[PDB]
C-alpha cells in the first residue's frame, strides 16, 4: 500500500530530515561551519548550506530536492538559502507526526499551502515597507541588510555601485523585481575594487582587430553567426586533397569566398563585429578576417554565444548569421566602442553609450588581485540580491528568526480558530516556526526553549518588541540593532519546503 510509499516517504522523510539538521548547525553565521571531505578526500569548511547541499551530497531523492530547496532560494532572493533548508525539517518533523497521527498526506499537504497563505500575511503584518522608488532608502536599507550580513567592506563601497547599477536597472518606482538579468557583472584582472565600475554599455571580453580600428565611435555592432571559412570540401579548405595543381585554382576559390562574405560584411556594414568563438563557429577563415579588419572594422572575436544572448538583449545587437542581417538592424549602435587595457592588467571592450534595450548596466569588477576581484563579487551580488529581495518584495522585515517566533503562536491559534481536523495540521504547521530560531538560539548560544518561550511572549506582546539579535543572538529589539531582511528571503523560503513537502507528501 501507500504505506510502502509512506515508508518510502518516511524513508525520504528519514533521509531529508537529518540532512536539514546539518545546515541547522550552520544556520546563521553564529551557526557553525561544517568540515566536508570530498572525492579529493580533503576538508571543506563552509557555513553555507547551499554548497554543503551541493558540494558533498547524497543523490537520495529527498536529498536531491533539498539542493533546489536552497537553489530556488539561491535563485529566488539570491539570499536566505540557509533558512529555506532550516524551514524544511521543521515541518518534515511535523508532517511525519501527522503521518504518525495517520493524517492523510494530501490532507497534510492540503492543509499547508492553504495555511501558508495565512502565515505570510501575519508575516507581512510584522513587516515594514520601505521606499523602493527611493534609491537612498534602499541604499540605506539593503546596506543595513548588508550591515545585517557579513560582507560589508566592499559591499559598503559596492552598495552605491550595487544600488546605482540597480537604480540604473530601476526604471520603476516599484523597482519591479530588479532582475540581475539586465546586469552584466564583468571582472577585469587589473585595477582595484575602487576600479570596479558601473558601465552603461557592455564591457566586452578583450577585443580582436587585425587592421580593424582600435576604437570606433557610434559603433554599429555586428555579429557573425555565419561561417567566414570557405566551405570545407576536404579538411577546412574549399580545395579537395589530391594534387597541387587542381587545388590551387580552388585555392583561388577559398580565397575570394572568404573575402567576399567579409566584403559583404562591411558592404551592408558594421562599425564593430561580435564574433563568437570559431569553435562556437564551424570555422572562421582568418585570411577573411585578416582582410576583414583590413576593411578597417573594429571587431571582437571569440565571445560567448550565451553572453551574445546577453549582448543581444541588453545592448540590442541581435543574432546575425547573414550579411543581410547586417544593416543597422540587428546591429546595436554603440556610442563609444573601445577596450580599456588600463588599471593594471586585463583588456575589455567597453561600450560607452549605446542603442540598447532597457537600461543596459554592466559593472566592471577590478580588484587588487583575482581574489580581491573575487571578494567584491558577492559584495555587489549580496547587495544586488538583498536589493532584488526587497525591490521585488517591498515590505522589509527584521531578521534573527523572530518573525518565526512571532508567527508560530499566532498560526497555532489561527489553526485552532480554523479548527477542523486540519487544525492539528495547521497546529503542527504553525509548530515548525520556532525551530529555526531555536537552533539559531543555540547557534548564537542560548536555551531557545528558555529564550524563544519569552520572545514568543514578547511576540505575543508587541508582536515584535524584541527578537533574537544576531550579535546579542538573544532577546532585544532586532530593529534596534537593525538585523533586517526583505520579506523575499523569508517568503521565498516558505513555499519551497512546504510545496516540496506538499510534493513529497503526495509523492509515493
Amino acid at each position: 500500500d501507500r504505506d510502502k510509499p509512506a515508508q518510502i516517504r518516511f524513508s525520504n522523510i528519514s533521509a531529508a530530515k537529518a540532512v536539514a539538521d546539518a545546515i541547522r548547525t550552520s544556520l546563521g553565521p553564529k551557526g557553525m561551519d561544517k568540515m566536508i571531505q570530498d572525492g579529493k578526500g580533503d576538508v571543506t569548511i563552509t557555513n553555507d548550506g547551499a554548497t554543503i547541499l551541493k558540494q558533498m551530497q547524497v543523490l537520495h531523492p529527498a536529498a536531491r530536492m533539498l539542493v533546489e530547496l536552497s537553489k530556488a532560494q539561491d535563485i529566488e532572493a539570491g539570499d536566505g538559502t540557509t533558512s529555506v533548508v532550516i524551514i524544511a525539517g521543521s515541518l518534515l518533523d511535523s508532517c511525519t507526526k501527522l503521518l504518525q497521527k495517520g493524517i492523510h498526506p494530501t490532507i497534510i499537504s492540503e492543509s499547508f499551502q492553504k495555511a501558508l497563505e495565512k502565515g505570510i500575511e501575519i508575516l507581512t503584518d510584522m513587516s515594514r515597507p520601505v521606499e523602493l522608488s527611493d534609491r537612498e532608502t534602499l541604499l540605506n536599507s539593503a546596506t543595513t541588510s548588508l550591515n545585517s550580513k557579513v560582507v560589508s567592506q566592499y559591499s559598503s563601497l559596492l552598495s552605491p555601485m550595487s544600488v546605482n547599477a540597480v537604480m540604473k536597472v530601476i526604471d520603476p518606482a516599484t523597482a519591479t523585481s530588479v532582475d540581475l538579468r539586465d546586469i552584466k557583472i564583468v571582472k577585469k584582472l587589473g585595477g582595484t575594487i575602487d576600479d570596479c565600475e558601473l558601465v552603461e554599455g557592455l564591457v566586452l571580453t578583450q577585443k580582436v582587430s587585425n587592421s580593424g580600428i582600435t576604437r570606433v565611435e557610434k559603433a554599429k555592432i555586428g555579429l557573425i553567426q555565419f561561417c567566414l571559412s570557405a566551405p570545407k570540401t576536404d579538411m577546412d579548405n574549399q580545395i579537395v586533397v589530391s594534387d597541387y595543381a587542381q587545388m590551387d585554382r580552388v585555392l583561388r576559390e577559398e580565397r575570394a569566398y572568404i573575402l567576399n562574405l567579409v566584403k559583404q560584411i562591411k558592404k551592408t556594414g558594421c562599425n564593430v563585429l561580435l564574433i563568437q568563438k570559431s569553435i562556437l563557429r564551424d570555422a572562421l577563415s582568418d585570411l577573411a578576417l585578416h582582410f576583414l579588419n583590413k576593411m578597417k572594422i573594429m571587431v571582437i572575436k571569440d565571445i560567448e554565444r550565451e553572453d551574445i544572448e546577453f549582448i543581444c538583449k541588453t545592448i540590442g545587437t541581435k543574432p546575425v548569421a547573414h550579411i543581410d542581417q547586417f544593416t543597422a538592424d540587428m546591429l546595436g549602435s554603440a556610442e563609444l566602442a573601445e577596450e580599456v587595457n588600463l588599471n593594471g592588467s586585463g583588456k575589455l571592450l567597453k561600450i560607452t553609450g549605446c542603442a540598447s534595450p532597457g537600461k543596459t548596466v554592466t559593472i566592471v569588477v577590478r580588484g587588487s588581485n583575482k581574489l580581491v576581484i573575487e571578494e567584491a563579487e558577492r559584495s555587489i551580488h549580496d547587495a544586488l540580491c538583498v536589493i532584488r529581495c526587497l525591490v521585488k518584495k517591498r515590505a522589509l522585515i527584521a531578521g534573527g528568526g523572530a518573525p518565526e517566533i512571532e508567527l508560530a503562536l499566532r498560526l497555532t491559534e489561527y489553526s485552532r480558530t480554523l479548527s477542523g481536523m486540519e487544525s492539528y495540521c495547521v497546529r503542527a504547521f504553525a509548530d515548525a516556526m520556532e525551530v529555526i530560531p531555536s537552533t539559531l538560539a543555540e547557534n548564537a548560544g542560548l536555551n531557545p526553549i528558555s529564550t524563544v518561550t519569552e520572545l514568543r511572549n514578547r511576540h505575543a506582546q508587541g508582536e515584535k518588541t524584541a527578537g533574537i539579535n544576531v550579535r546579542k543572538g538573544g532577546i532585544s529589539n532586532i530593529l534596534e540593532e537593525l538585523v533586517v531582511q526583505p520579506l523575499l528571503v523569508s517568503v521565498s523560503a516558505l513555499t519551497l519546503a512546504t510545496e516540496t513537502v506538499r510534493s513529497i507528501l503526495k509523492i509515493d
Binding site: 500500500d1 501507500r2 510509499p5 518510502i8 525520504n12 543523490l59 537520495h60 531523492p61 536531491r64 530536492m65 493524517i103 492523510h104 498526506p105 494530501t106 490532507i107 510534493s503 507528501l505 503526495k506 509523492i507 509515493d508
Partner: protein
C-alpha cells in the same frame, strides 16, 4: 522456455498488474498522490507524475499483463483521450476480484461470462447514465467546458489550462456537430507568456516572411503548391548533370534558371498574391514572386499547408503539375502578426467556418510541452462528444449506479455467472473508493453512502474528492463525458478476462 501454467501465471499476472495497477491509482484524480518516477539505469532522475503513462515507460516491466496493459493504458489514452490511468487500474480493480475467485478455485470461464455479461448491466446503466449534453448550445458550451478541464484536470496541468480550455472549446465550439481537428489549427510554440495563447479564427503560418516578401495580402489567394525551385519537382523543364567536355558547366545551370522563372510565371499565371510552397522557394523565384506581389512562403507548415488548403479553401498543385488546375486557398486577410515572441502570419477569414488556429504559449517549453498532449485528449473527447453530445455521472455516480444495476444483475442471474458479476460490480464501486483514498477520506462510508445513495439509486450525486463530501452529478462539473467513461469501462473489462485467458504462459527468456 518456461511453461507457466495458471499457478505461476496468475500470481505473476497479479503481482505486476495489481501492484502496478496500484501505481496508476496511486496517482489518480486531483487528490491522486504522486509517485516518484524511478529513473532506472539512468541517474536516479526523480520525476513526479500523476500520470501512469509515464510510469509505463520509466521502469521497464517483465510482468506480462503489466507489459500488455501498458498498451491497455495507452489505448484509452491514445484514442479515448482522458482515462489513461482510469482504464489501467480498472483491470487491477478486476484481477483483485479475480484473485479471491481463482482463490475460490473459480474458473475464468466461470468468471468471464459473469463479468463480461455484467458489463452490459454496467453498460446499459452507463447507457442509461448516458445523458445528452451539447444538445443545447449552452449545454454544448457547458459540455465543452465540463469535459475540457476534466480531461486535463488530473493530467497534471490545471494552472493556465483555464485559458487554453476556453480557446480549445472555443475552437471545438465552431466544429458544430462535425468534429474537425484540421479545421482548428494547432500552434504549439514556446514564447509569449503562460497565457499569451491566442485562437486565430482562420489558418496561421507561423513563418516570418518580414516585408521582403508580402506579409499582408488582402483578398488573399493562397496557392497551395509543392514547387521545388532547386530540387525542381516534376513539370521540370531542365537538363541534368553531364560532362561532354570542359565547357559543359554552362549548359546545365541555364536549364534550371528558365524553369524557375517559367514556374514563377505559372505561379503568376493563377493571379495569386500568395504562393504557399511546401518546398523551397529559391532566390530567383522569390524575387519574381516579390516582383508580382506574390507572397512566397517556402516550406510552409507541413501539416499546415493541407490544413491551410482545407480551412482556407484551396487545393494542392500536386507536385506543381498544374499551371492552372490547382484550386487556390482564400482567406480574408493574410497578415504577419507577432504572437508570443515570433511573427506569425495569420490567415483570417479562411473558407472554413469551423476553422480556427490555436496558438499555445508557454513560459518555458516544460510548460508548453505537457499541456497540448493533455489538451489533445480533451478535444478528442470533445470531438467524441461533438459526435455524441453527452456526459455520464462520475465520481461514482454512474459507477455505484452501474455497479447497482450489475449488483442487481448479480442478484438476478446469479449462477456461477453472477458469482462473478458480484465481484464485477464491486470493482465498479472500488474506483469510487480509490478517489476518496486519493483524498484520504472515508471510502467505506461515502461509497456505502453513495451506495446508500445508489441502492435506492441516485443518478444526481456522487462523491466529491475535491469537496471531500458527496456531491451532485447534474454536471456539477465533475460529471464526465459518456465518451470516456464508456470506453474506460470497455478496454479493461476485456483485458482482465483476457488476463484470465492465459493460464498457459511459456516464457523462453
Amino acid at each position: 522456455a518456461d511453461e507457466e501454467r495458471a499457478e505461476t501465471a496468475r500470481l505473476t499476472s497479479f503481482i505486476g498488474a495489481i501492484a502496478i495497477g496500484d501505481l496508476v491509482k496511486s496517482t489518480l484524480g486531483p487528490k491522486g498522490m504522486d509517485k516518484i518516477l524511478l529513473s532506472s539505469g539512468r541517474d536516479a532522475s526523480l520525476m513526479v507524475t500523476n500520470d501512469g503513462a509515464t510510469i509505463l515507460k520509466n521502469i521497464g516491466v517483465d510482468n506480462p499483463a503489466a507489459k500488455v496493459l501498458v498498451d491497455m493504458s495507452r489505448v484509452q489514452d491514445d484514442e479515448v483521450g482522458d482515462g489513461t490511468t482510469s482504464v489501467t487500474v480498472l483491470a487491477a480493480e478486476l484481477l483483485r476480484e479475480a484473485e479471491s475467485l481463482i482463490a475460490k478455485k473459480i474458473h475464468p470461464q466461470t468468471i468471464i461470462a459473469g463479468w463480461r455479461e455484467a458489463t452490459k448491466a454496467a453498460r446499459e446503466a452507463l447507457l442509461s447514465s448516458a445523458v445528452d449534453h451539447g444538445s443545447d448550445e449552452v449545454k454544448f458550451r457547458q459540455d465543452l467546458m465540463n469535459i475540457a478541464g476534466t480531461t486535463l484536470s488530473s493530467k497534471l496541468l490545471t494552472h493556465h489550462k483555464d485559458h487554453f480550455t476556453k480557446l480549445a472549446v472555443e475552437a471545438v465550439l465552431r466544429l458544430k456537430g462535425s468534429g474537425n481537428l484540421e479545421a482548428i489549427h494547432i500552434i504549439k510554440k514556446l514564447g509569449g507568456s503562460l497565457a499569451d495563447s491566442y485562437l486565430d479564427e482562420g489558418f496561421l503560418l507561423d513563418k516570418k516572411i518580414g516585408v521582403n516578401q508580402p506579409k499582408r495580402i488582402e483578398n488573399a489567394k493562397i496557392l497551395i503548391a509543392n514547387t521545388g525551385m532547386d530540387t525542381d519537382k516534376i513539370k521540370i523543364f531542365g537538363s541534368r548533370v553531364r560532362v561532354d567536355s570542359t565547357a559543359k558547366v554552362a549548359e546545365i545551370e541555364h536549364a534550371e534558371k528558365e524553369k524557375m522563372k517559367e514556374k514563377v510565371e505559372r505561379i503568376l499565371k493563377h493571379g495569386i498574391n500568395c504562393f504557399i510552397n511546401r518546398q523551397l522557394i529559391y532566390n530567383y523565384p522569390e524575387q519574381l514572386f516579390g516582383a508580382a506581389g506574390v507572397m512566397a512562403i517556402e516550406h510552409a507548415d507541413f501539416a499546415g499547408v493541407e490544413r491551410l488548403a482545407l480551412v482556407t479553401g484551396g487545393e494542392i498543385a500536386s507536385t506543381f503539375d498544374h499551371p492552372e488546375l490547382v484550386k487556390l486557398g482564400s482567406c480574408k486577410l493574410i497578415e504577419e502578426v507577432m504572437i508570443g515572441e515570433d511573427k506569425l502570419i495569420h490567415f483570417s477569414g479562411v473558407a472554413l467556418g469551423e476553422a480556427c488556429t490555436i496558438v499555445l504559449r508557454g513560459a518555458t517549453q516544460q510548460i508548453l510541452d505537457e499541456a497540448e498532449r493533455s489538451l489533445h485528449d480533451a478535444l478528442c473527447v470533445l470531438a467524441q462528444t461533438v459526435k455524441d453530445s453527452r456526459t455520464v455521472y462520475g465520481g461514482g455516480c454512474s459507477e455505484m449506479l452501474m455497479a447497482h444495476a450489475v449488483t442487481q444483475l448479480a442478484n438476478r442471474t446469479p449462477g456461477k455467472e453472477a458469482v462473478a458479476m458480484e465481484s464485477y460490480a464491486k470493482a465498479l464501486r472500488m474506483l469510487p473508493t480509490i478517489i476518496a483514498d486519493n483524498a484520504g477520506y472515508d471510502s467505506a462510508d461515502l461509497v456505502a453512502q453513495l451506495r446508500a445513495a445508489h441502492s435506492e439509486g441516485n443518478t444526481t450525486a456522487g462523491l466529491d474528492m475535491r469537496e471531500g463530501t458527496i456531491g451532485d452529478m447534474a454536471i456539477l462539473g465533475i460529471t464526465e463525458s459518456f465518451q470516456v467513461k464508456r470506453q474506460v469501462l470497455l478496454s479493461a473489462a476485456e483485458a482482465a478476462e483476457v488476463i484470465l485467458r492465459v493460464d498457459n504462459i511459456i516464457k523462453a527468456a
